[PDB]
Design a protein around this nucleic acid. Structure first.
Lengths: 69, 137, 197, 68, 125, 106
RNA sequence: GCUCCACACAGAUGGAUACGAAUAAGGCGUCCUUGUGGCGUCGCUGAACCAUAGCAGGCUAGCAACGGUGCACUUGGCGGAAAGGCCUUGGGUGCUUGCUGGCGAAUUGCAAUGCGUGGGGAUAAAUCAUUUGUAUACGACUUAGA
RNA sequence: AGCGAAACCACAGCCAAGGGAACGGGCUUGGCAGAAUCAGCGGGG
RNA sequence: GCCCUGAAAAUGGAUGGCGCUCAAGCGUGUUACCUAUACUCUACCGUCAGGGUUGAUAUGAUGCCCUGACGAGUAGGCAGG
RNA sequence: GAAAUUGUUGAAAGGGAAGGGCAUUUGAUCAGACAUGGUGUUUUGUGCCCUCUGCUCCUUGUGGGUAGGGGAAUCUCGCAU
């Protein structure tokens, strides 16, 4: 399952974006820019907003050499 | 705590080693009064000594049933030495100013001596049994 | 898989069954065998009845009592059979036949709970159709086991009290298989099918 | 201030902060059945005729509570 | 030092046959000599005997866990020979050197940069 | 809600052996549902953990672990070869070993 | 055991998911002429079934159902093979992902699972010692005694 | 109740079968095996 | 060809055991797999052989290297500790 | 003041044998830095620094030891802040 990603500006973040030398108020501003520019595209497809919020697990009889992802 | 215990050694004792090992171990960890009384009872053939290691050809008696053994005997000379000791230890403690009523043979121990003779050292050690306690809210 | 695999002899081949029941404990697999008496074997009867007594004679000399004890009761018959392919004697062994349990009949708490079988070991499915094949029950008896009946009788009971059960269930389902049927064909459903379900 | 040489506690210092009469000690013993309450414990001191003594007496009187 | 990873080859002690059964026969290795002996004929299951293959990698030989070669220093002159090999040798102060003398060998080695393999020897705080 | 399982539950069968001489470095693992060498190839080189409680608490948890890799297959049944850091104990022959899904090829 | 003090703390990780008998036969559904009866249909693997979304599963707003389910209670019934469980009635209280919401998750920094003691007190009994002999190498056994 | 040796001592001591060589006592495959101890035979080595 | 018979006793008894019968037996064929101190490859030890190395080498030329092969062993021989 | 050997205590193991080798687990236990910088700049303050004046030991310039003053507004030459 692929989404639309082309609406997103991502080029701000590289390696150096992740140094540390209580959460930085700069970092949370980039969250919401990405997220709101993303939510839109997830809302198109049915159940995807719900699909993402859930946790993947293995269930009895899921043999993962058989399984398709 | 050494401020709580009184010891009493006896050495180069012309007693059968093997019998002593027994009467000692028999009495190991007893309240001094119940202990001393018991050695009177072995003397009167009321109770017998549970021989355990050095015990081949000891004639089975019911008195053994008190402990968990079938074999048991009444040995005079051994015990004669051991209550001789206990009596001493008691008196040591009274010089040290203790409570004799709480007393107990914490550690007794017997090992051979030089030699044919077969002599043996004994060291028993008696202690106050510490209790007495309270709290608040 | 399942923590306890209550098996069920009823048409298996003492051997084979065993073997596998075996491996499975060795590989840490709590089993439990039932209806031992309805275990089977290979060959006529008047055989197993030998390939046994012989076994019987065995026993010890100077002191008969100390020796190869000849158990009668099925269960055990079959036990042996098995405690015979498991290095019994060694932690890992004992540690097994530790994991085992072989009742004749099918007493609680197992009555109430699904069992199963072990292909790779049913008369029907291994013995060239129509060939001599013995059936413990007799074979026990024939040589001591004093109960064949108790089991038997105090059986029929079970079967009953169950089937009865059944019903009540068969009745139940039906209803479902009916509800689902009707409330089946409405969208939602449909969809599923597409995916498959 | 407590110190360790080897894996055992040994030295123990008591400095009074301005001015500063300052001691240092060698613990020998240490061990571990009481399980004490949160009530504040009573002091007792024994044998101190010497003036150097009732300076160490004069230490602990201070360094432990005068609440009890 | 960026030393090579030191391979130990054989970490168990080479005990002597039967040094376990009898209290007279000692843990100090000695070859077996009877021609009916199994050890000498290296039957399976029986104790491993020292052969030349267990020999250590010549690059890593003598090297302790620190990746330094042990070296015994008696006095403060003998230490100052390693003035040049701090990266390679470790000043083991020798066992008989006193308390009063040691504290002086530790002064220098700390200053020179020699890693002493055995400090806290006799010394307290 | 019921499952948090992100691993396949296999059992620890043996050390690779002979009739006579076992090498304890190569632990043999059965994995759940795997039947062939083909199905096993998938699991090759995923990390295994053997997990167990011990008596004493160590890092705020009584619950210790060993780690290791599926390395190659073994016969046809899908029994697989596996090497741990410290070898697995033998006393654990026929115990559960949690086989994981990193590293993915998928 | 009850009571008072003092201390001490062979491998779970969604579900063992209940007919019996036969296998040159069987389920399951339906009509009854109630049968070794007819018509329909299934099987060729559990690859199923049932559960399964929420901080390892939070805090709050409604809609639609009148159900699902958890928990101590309560009514009645069943289970003796190793019953030591399995159902049901009534109410209370949670939860509901059946439907739609509104908030929180970060920094854990790119992997390293995340119920006994040692003394007391009260009271049940056994043993020793005594007595008897149906017993006896010694034990053990049998008796009797507030 | 006391006193109190010596000879002796590689080590242990359950059966059944197999272990080629008038070799079975440790091995192989089984049967099995619960601590502790006293009294018999005249039983075998 | 397979099968029964084609005699052998005497302490209980052994395809090694359990057990096996459209085999887990016999005959044959095909593939898959299991594992030795065997073979291949890499590192390491040591030994032997061949060599390099001085108007001197960022370590004792009785040094410091380069290449290759080899490694059971009693009496016995030689050598280093 | 060794070893055999003996007692006591604590831990552990023990269904007709124990000790040994390969490998790990658990239990108890032992280690586990008087490590604390490095570099590049910037205030100052000092000296073996600059500079004024010297004194002395010896062998060849490519020398060694050590006084008296002054000065940082040049100087990182060293060393402390």
């Amino acid at each position: 399952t692929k989404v639309s990603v082309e609406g997103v500006n991502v080029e701000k973040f590289n390696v150096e974006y992740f140094a540390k030398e209580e959460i930085k108020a700069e970092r949370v501003e980039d969250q919401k820019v990405v997220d709101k520019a993303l939510i839109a595209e997830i809302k198109k497809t049915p159940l995807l907003k719900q699909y993402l919020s859930a946790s993947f697990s293995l269930k009895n009889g899921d043999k993962p050499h058989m399984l398709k992802f | 705590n050494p401020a709580k215990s009184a010891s009493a050694r006896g050495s180069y004792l012309r007693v059968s080693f093997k019998n002593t090992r027994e009467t000692a171990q028999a009495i190991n960890g007893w309240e001094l009064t119940k202990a001393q009384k018991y050695l009177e009872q072995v003397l009167d053939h009321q109770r017998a000594i549970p021989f355990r290691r050095f015990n081949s050809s000891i004639g089975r008696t019911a008195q053994g049933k008190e402990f968990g053994v079938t074999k048991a005997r009444w040995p005079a000379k051994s015990v004669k030495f051991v209550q001789g000791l206990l009596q001493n230890a008691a008196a040591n403690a009274e010089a040290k100013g203790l409570d004799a009523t709480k007393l107990y043979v914490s550690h007794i121990q017997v090992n051979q001596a030089p030699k044919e003779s077969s002599p043996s050292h004994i060291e028993l050690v008696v202690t106050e049994k510490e209790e007495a306690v309270a709290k608040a809210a | 898989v399942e923590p306890v695999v209550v098996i069920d002899g009823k048409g298996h081949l003492v051997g084979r069954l065993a073997s596998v029941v075996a491996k499975q404990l060795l590989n840490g697999q709590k089993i439990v065998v039932v209806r031992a008496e309805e275990l089977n074997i290979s060959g006529e009867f008047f055989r197993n009845k030998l390939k046994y007594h012989d076994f019987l004679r065995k026993a010890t000399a100077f002191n008969k009592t100390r020796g190869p004890f000849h158990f009668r009761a099925p269960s055990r018959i079959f036990y042996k059979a098995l405690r015979g392919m498991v290095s019994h004697k060694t932690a890992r062994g004992k540690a097994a036949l530790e994991r085992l349990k072989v009742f004749e009949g099918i007493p609680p708490p197992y009555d109430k709970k699904k069992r199963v079988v072990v292909p790779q070991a049913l008369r029907v499915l291994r013995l060239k159709p129509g060939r001599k094949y013995t059936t413990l029950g007799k074979l026990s008896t024939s040589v001591g086991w004093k109960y064949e009946d108790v089991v038997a009788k105090l059986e029929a009971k079970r079967k009953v009290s169950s089937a009865e059960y059944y019903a009540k269930k068969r009745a139940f389902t039906k209803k479902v298989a009916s509800a689902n049927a009707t409330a089946a064909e409405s969208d939602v459903a449909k969809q599923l099918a597409a995916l498959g379900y | 201030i407590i110190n360790e040489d080897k894996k055992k506690v040994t030295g123990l210092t008591f400095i009074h902060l301005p001015e500063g009469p300052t001691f240092y000690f060698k613990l020998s013993s240490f061990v571990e059945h009481g399980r004490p309450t949160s009530h504040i414990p009573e002091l007792i001191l024994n044998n101190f005729q010497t003036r150097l003594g009732q300076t160490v007496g004069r230490l602990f009187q201070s360094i432990l509570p005068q609440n009890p | 030092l960026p030393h090579p990873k030191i391979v130990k080859k054989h970490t168990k002690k080479f005990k002597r046959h039967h040094s376990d059964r009898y209290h007279r026969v000692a843990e100090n290795w000695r070859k077996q000599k009877g021609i009916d002996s199994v050890v000498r004929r290296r039957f399976r299951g029986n104790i491993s005997q020292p052969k030349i293959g267990y020999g250590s990698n010549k690059k890593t030989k003598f090297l302790s866990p620190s990746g330094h070669k042990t070296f015994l220093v008696a006095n403060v002159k003998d230490l100052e020979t390693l003035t040049m090999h701090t990266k390679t040798y470790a000043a083991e102060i020798a066992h008989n050197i006193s308390a009063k003398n040691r504290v002086v060998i530790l002064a220098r080695a700390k200053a020179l940069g020699i890693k002493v393999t055995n400090p806290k020897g006799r010394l307290a705080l | 809600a019921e499952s948090h399982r992100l691993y396949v539950k296999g059992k620890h069968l043996s050390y690779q052996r002979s009739k006579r001489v076992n090498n304890p470095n190569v632990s043999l693992i059965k994995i759940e549902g795997v039947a062939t060498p083909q199905d096993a190839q998938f699991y090759l080189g995923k990390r295994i953990a053997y997990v167990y409680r011990a008596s004493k608490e160590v890092r705020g948890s009584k619950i210790r672990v060993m780690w290791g890799k599926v390395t190659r297959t073994h016969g046809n049944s899908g029994v697989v070869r596996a090497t741990f850091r410290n070898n697995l104990p033998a006393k654990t022959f026929g115990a559960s070993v949690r086989i994981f899904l990193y590293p993915s090829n998928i």
